Design a binder for this molecule. Structure first.
Ligand SMILES: Nc1nc2c(ncn2[C@@H]2O[C@H](COP(=O)(O)OP(=O)(O)OP(=O)(O)OP(=O)(O)OC[C@H]3O[C@@H](n4cnc5c(N)ncnc54)[C@H](O)[C@@H]3O)[C@@H](O)[C@H]2O)c(=O)[nH]1
Ligand SMILES: Nc1ccn([C@@H]2O[C@H](COP(=O)(O)CP(=O)(O)OP(=O)(O)O)[C@@H](O)[C@H]2O)c(=O)n1
Lengths: 48, 93, 105, 226, 52, 49, 48, 228
């Protein structure tokens, strides 16, 4: 059954238990932004 | 898509010319604080905030709308840049 | 035999017929033996482009809509209408495709 | 808590309506839109052409000499006839149409009847040439929803043809729920409802009737009879 | 709280550039109007994924 | 950066034979490798999400 | 830090199916069995 | 062709299970009534939950207590299952006190009695203490609606209190069944049956009444048109 309407999905649906793991690639550790910051010594370009 | 983008693309022989014209008009609008616009107050681009409706702060939107109105003239060697700048200051302090 | 697409879709809403059943619908002054789903797709395109005659010209009614036909529809809509209306049609197609894939089963 | 929502109306004529309700608590957009849509499509009272009698035709797949259209075409045209009853006591109505000569038979060619109003006199019914005749007897009832012809199959006379009864005055309803924010909260709901009717009832009246029906049905959870 | 409203004022009408490596063709960079969202993930339109 | 802890799985007075589990390590459930969770899944499209 | 599952985190099963969480739905919106039990995860069949 | 008022039947099992039957209904109205009520019941029924915990000589949630088998994280996980019933509608917050010394099996019944407050699951296991272990807890329980994470409310009474994620909804499960029924000549009529499982703090009937009230109040909102 669809939770938004209460009407059934028009066809039978495969349903069952699955083993699922969380991977260490998390958005918390990857989101990054910069306006201005430190620069390199020689090229005077932004650091990485 | 931007409103009337097909019209703007058809008003010029090269799309990059349209980009140049829009950017230069936006710079003109920013320099004079929107006092040199050819829009009448009811066509002014509006922005919605909690306080209320205000003018749209984005100058590129203003320039594009003005180009849609068709009251702007663009071309090669229309007016010497120095005279244009002096007149722009004189008309709009 | 339905007098207009609204009647056929109302009959669909009452469970009388399915979207995939072949019935007779009166559309554009003509009597078409088609399915309510294909009529619904034609209406989707027509309302997306805000033009009924051009939309009727663009679509192929008597075939299931697959990748090639949808791509050809997008190209023809681009040519006939421009980028703004083509993008609007693309958004409409995306919305309705997602909606109908959810409940298809 | 949060303040009471704002309800906004945008009506095109007496045939189209858009209604905006915002802001709403999370998940309430569909919670309100779906039952209202079901009631609007299913339970709004109206009137519809239910049966038809034409002479010299034995079934719906026959034809009438002197008229360009077949039986199916005039029946389909009759399916879009909009009739309004002004007094609540009237239940069923019989309309007679007399047509002769080369003419463009519309709805106004129906003979006037007390306490019955034809809302689309310009609706095209038939085309007659020289020497063509059309005598028509249409039975119109009042009901709710959509009932196929085979379900009721009520035929006044022995030659009368049952007609699919489009009782619903509402032709189409769509609704959309869009995310909206208010202050720091950003998960609120905005509900948009678009209603197309046939003109016998305005979209606002249809929405009010649907809301009233839902309220009456909610009242039913009060007295535990058992 | 008011700084978020100021931020909404700042980006009005402006666009940002989204890029996915490797940039094989020019459609690997595209301009989009930013809608401010909660969370830490960029939300991408389904119809530009094939180009990207 | 993950946190590794051992959690006791016995009580005072319990009889333990040789090799019997005393404490679960990280990602372990009663001496079985436990890398995730068992969840109820449905295989279907959902609104493009 | 105690990290909960959020949008943008990566999940996977043992058969090579991986994906980031793109939406967290409330319980009343999830598809449910006729006895009222809602599902926890919805996987797209197009990956099979 | 107006339908007569349908009969409304109630069956109850304890304070935790309820069946509510409405019959007969117009065709299709079973879903029209059941689904919004199910959504409201699963979403918007107020209840009570543990919102804060303070434990003696404990500075944060990632620690252990000597003489106690479970660390603080598992203790808080156990405490999130506590069902507390407020006998007074005006009461908003309570603080339960627990003091125990090992060796014992500290359950929910060991909480000190409070006026107008009941524990609906006194058998809920909280901790295991050995000889020499001591447990001193102050648990703040609040009224609320929905699911509020600890990082949102951030409720602390003392300096060393640990905020706890609050799941206020007292309804555990909702289902509804639409069955075939008829009345004389009418056929294909609906019979609706709502099945509600709660945790005992709120009875299924009370939750159903609150859901009906919420739906009626929201239906009220369609009464003030404004021009655009
Ligand atoms: N242009 C580009 N796009 C890529 C590439 N490879 C993946 N994608 C995208 O990323 C999605 C998820 O791909 P994956 O499901 O494979 O996930 P992942 O992030 O690559 O992580 P891993 O499974 O590799 O885990 P790990 O512990 O081994 O990572 C640590 C070790 O990986 C390798 N490694 C990790 N990160 C990167 C990276 N950014 N670039 C290159 N090598 C990377 C490396 O050698 C490192 O020393 C794919 O669909 C693609 O869109 C790539 O080469 N170039
Ligand atoms: N060295 C690399 C490796 C990957 N990539 C990029 O990652 C995509 C997916 O590779 P992938 O191997 O992650 C998956 P795909 O081939 O799409 O999957 P399937 O057949 O199993 O369904 C490629 O199409 C490249 O754009 C890259 O630029 N440099």
């Amino acid at each position: 059954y669809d939770g938004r309407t209460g009407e059934p999905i028009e066809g039978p649906i495969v349903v069952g238990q699955m083993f699922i793991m969380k991977l260490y690639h998390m958005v918390e550790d990857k989101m990054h932004a910069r306006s201005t910051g430190p620069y390199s010594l020689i090229t005077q370009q932004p650091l990485g | 898509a931007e409103p009337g983008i097909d019209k703007l693309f058809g008003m010029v022989d090269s799309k990059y010319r349209l980009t140049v014209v829009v950017a230069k008009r936006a710079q003109q609008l920013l320099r004079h604080g929107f006092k040199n616009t050819v829009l009448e107050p009811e066509e002014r681009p509006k922005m919605q905030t909690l306080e209320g409706l205000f003018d749209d702060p984005n100058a590129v939107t203003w320039a594009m709308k003005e180009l849609l109105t068709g009251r702007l003239v663009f071309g090669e060697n229309l007016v010497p840049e120095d005279r244009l700048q002096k007149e722009m200051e004189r008309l709009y302090p | 035999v339905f007098a207009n697409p609204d009647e056929a879709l109302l009959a669909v809403a009452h469970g009388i017929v399915d979207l995939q059943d072949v019935v007779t619908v009166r559309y554009m002054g003509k009597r078409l033996e088609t399915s309510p789903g294909r009529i619904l797709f034609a209406r989707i395109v027509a309302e997306a482009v805000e033009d009924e005659k051009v939309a009727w010209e663009l679509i192929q009614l008597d075939v299931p809509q697959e990748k090639n036909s949808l791509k050809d529809l997008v190209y023809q809509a681009f040519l006939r209408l421009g980028m703004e209306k083509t993008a609007r049609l693309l958004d409409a197609l995306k919305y309705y495709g997602f909606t109908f894939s959810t409940t298809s089963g | 808590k949060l303040k009471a929502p704002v309800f906004t109306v945008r009506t095109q004529g007496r045939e189209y309506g858009e209604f905006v309700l915002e802001p709403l608590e999370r998940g309430f957009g569909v919670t309100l839109g779906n039952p209202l849509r079901r009631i609007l499509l299913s339970s709004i009272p109206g009137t519809a052409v239910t049966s038809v009698y034409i002479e010299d035709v034995l079934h719906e797949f026959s034809t009438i000499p002197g008229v360009k259209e077949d039986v199916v075409e005039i029946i389909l045209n009759l399916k879009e006839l909009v009739v309004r009853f002004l007094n609540p006591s009237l239940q069923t109505v019989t309309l007679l149409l007399k047509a002769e000569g080369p003419k463009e038979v519309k709805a106004r060619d129906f003979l006037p009847v007390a306490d019955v109003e034809i809302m689309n006199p310009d609706l095209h019914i038939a085309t007659l040439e020289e020497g063509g005749r059309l005598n028509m007897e249409v039975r119109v009832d009042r009901g709710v929803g959509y009932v196929p012809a085979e379900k009721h199959g009520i035929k006044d006379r022995i030659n009368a043809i049952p007609v699919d009864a489009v009782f619903s005055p509402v032709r189409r309803v769509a609704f959309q729920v869009e995310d909206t924010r208010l202050g720091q909260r950003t998960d609120l709901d905005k509900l948009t409802l678009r209603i197309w009717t046939d003109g016998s009832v305005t979209p606002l009246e249809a929405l009010n009737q649907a809301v009233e029906i839902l309220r009456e049905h909610l009242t039913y959870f009060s007295n535990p009879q058992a | 709280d008011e700084v978020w409203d100021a931020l909404e004022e700042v980006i009005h009408g402006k666009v940002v550039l989204l890029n996915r490596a490797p940039t094989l063709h020019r459609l690997g960079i595209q301009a989009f109007q930013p809608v401010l969202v909660e969370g830490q993930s960029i939300q991408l339109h389904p119809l530009v994924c094939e180009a990207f | 950066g993950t946190a590794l802890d051992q959690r006791p799985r016995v009580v005072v007075g319990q009889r333990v034979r040789k090799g019997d589990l005393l404490a679960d390590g990280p990602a372990s459930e009663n001496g079985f490798l436990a890398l995730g969770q068992n969840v109820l899944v449905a295989i279907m499209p959902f609104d493009g999400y | 830090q105690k990290r909960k599952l959020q949008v943008g985190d990566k999940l996977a099963n043992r058969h090579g199916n991986k994906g980031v969480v793109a939406k967290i739905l409330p319980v009343e919106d999830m598809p449910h069995l006729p006895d009222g039990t809602p599902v926890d995860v919805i996987l797209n069949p197009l990956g099979v």
